């Protein structure tokens, strides 16, 4: 994990240009642009590679890598110094509000539909990243996160009778 963070930060071009650089802001605008590109077929191949879905998968994979690359659950991080430094680097690279906003998108719950877009698995990477780099230890933070990113998705999941195309 340490050498991977070192290599990624030494060559910063590995991160997506929408997240990193003097141009794009971060994951919020990246995800919104990916959603509009996925819905609008004019920015794809006229079984083709959905460019919006591919961008979404790339960012979800990057976030999952960073989350699983986080030092620990503060077992060794409580008494170590380099773990604290790696956690601080991860926190400085990705802002928390961006992560909360991306979690709160409330995808639709669809006669089936096509799942080659914003897959629900993309949110699991963000959840794991929050749990590992930041965690849930503040009452108001936990409550606001549940309000903005979980209740709508929980309702969408609970609103099933027979048409269950997505497990």
């Amino acid at each position: 994990a340490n050498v991977v963070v070192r290599l990624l930060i030494r060559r910063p071009e590995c991160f997506g240009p929408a997240l990193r650089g003097e141009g794009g802001n971060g994951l919020l605008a990246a995800m919104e642009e990916a959603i509009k590109i996925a819905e609008d077929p004019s920015r794809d191949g006229p079984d083709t590679i959905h460019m919006g879905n591919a961008i979404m998968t790339f960012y979800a994979a990057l976030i999952d890598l960073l989350g699983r690359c986080a030092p620990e659950m503060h077992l060794i991080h409580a008494g170590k110094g380099e773990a604290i430094r790696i956690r601080s680097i991860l926190r400085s690279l990705i802002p928390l509000g961006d992560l909360v906003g991306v979690i709160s998108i409330a995808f639709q719950m669809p006669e089936p539909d096509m799942s080659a877009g914003f897959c629900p698995d993309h949110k699991a990477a963000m959840v794991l990243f929050l749990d590992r780099v930041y965690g849930i230890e503040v009452q108001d933070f936990l409550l606001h996160l549940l309000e903005v990113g979980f209740l709508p998705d929980l309702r969408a999941a609970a609103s099933l009778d027979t048409a269950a195309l997505s497990x």
Partner: protein, 400 residues
Amino acid sequence: IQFLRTDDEVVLQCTATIHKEQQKLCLAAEGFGNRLCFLESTSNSKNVPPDLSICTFVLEQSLSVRALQEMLANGHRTLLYGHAILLRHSYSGMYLCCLSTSRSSTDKLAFDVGLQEDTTGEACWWTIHPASKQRSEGEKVRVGDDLILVSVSSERYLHLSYGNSSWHVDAAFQQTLWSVAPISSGSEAAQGYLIGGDVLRLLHGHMDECLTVPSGEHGEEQRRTVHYEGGAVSVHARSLWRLETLRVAWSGSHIRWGQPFRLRHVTTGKYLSLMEDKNLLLMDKEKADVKSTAFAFRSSKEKLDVGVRKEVDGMGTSEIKYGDSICYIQHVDTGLWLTYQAVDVKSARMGSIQRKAIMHHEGHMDDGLNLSRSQHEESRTARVIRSTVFLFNRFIRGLD
């Protein structure tokens, strides 16, 4: 070939090629009043000289990563690559560290570099790496080597960030080459001898007077005037001078006779300029020409040697003392000498005794310029006086 020892004053310069033009930008720190650093123009020193006084740091300790982490979990050495150094600001006495806040919205991931008082933590330490494949870790560093400074805490490079007006060095992940120009080798600095970059003043042998300007009771245009004065001015802030040499390396060496150097007023921050239609006055930095503001000290009155000394890349030789060293001011352009006048007529002789200093050819064979260095306390007090008066005057107009 000269190695970088410890407890020596060095300078951190770099080259910046923006808008198809190269420039040599230095690392400077105001110290008092602000924390973050900034850049200084070592190049273009023909009309605007660089404030080298605040671009000087001193290396305290050179420990390895293991030794540093052991001391954190708890001598004239030689600088090696891969080690960790502690850059103490030479003037302010604080220490260079990597700040935590951010100022450039263009770099959403970089940190600032500034000064801090305490030496605790990993922020105030910087690990050294080479900028070439010919030198690996553990080799001894020499003068002129291009170095790379990496933060120990943030693991960021001391990067030269570019901006329209925010030309400020920060802690970014893109490396930048830095050259280390020595000022004082930390070797045996001859006590009682004149050293470059010193803050001192002048006295006479049997007159007990000093070269100074009017106090703050008069306007700035009247303070620009230059004269001699005695009494309590002997211990005063407006009576000190600084020998700002022209070289950017080894400027804090033994100043020898004949070499050029600007005379800076510590209280006003201006230099002794001279335009031939008038006498010498004080003028600011934004138009200080080398030929106009360059002076030297001669040991006699003749013109036997002018262009004899060109460049010495070293500490030099202990020649000019403070007490028993009768110098004579000589301009690099006109070659005139100091003369005391009687500007105060007999009608007001017993009032404020001031004899204006006109620089002329003949002079009087009774000057006897004696050097006298001021303690670090006095120098720090005078410079912080200038800094705070500048900030407070700007604030007064900005509020008015």
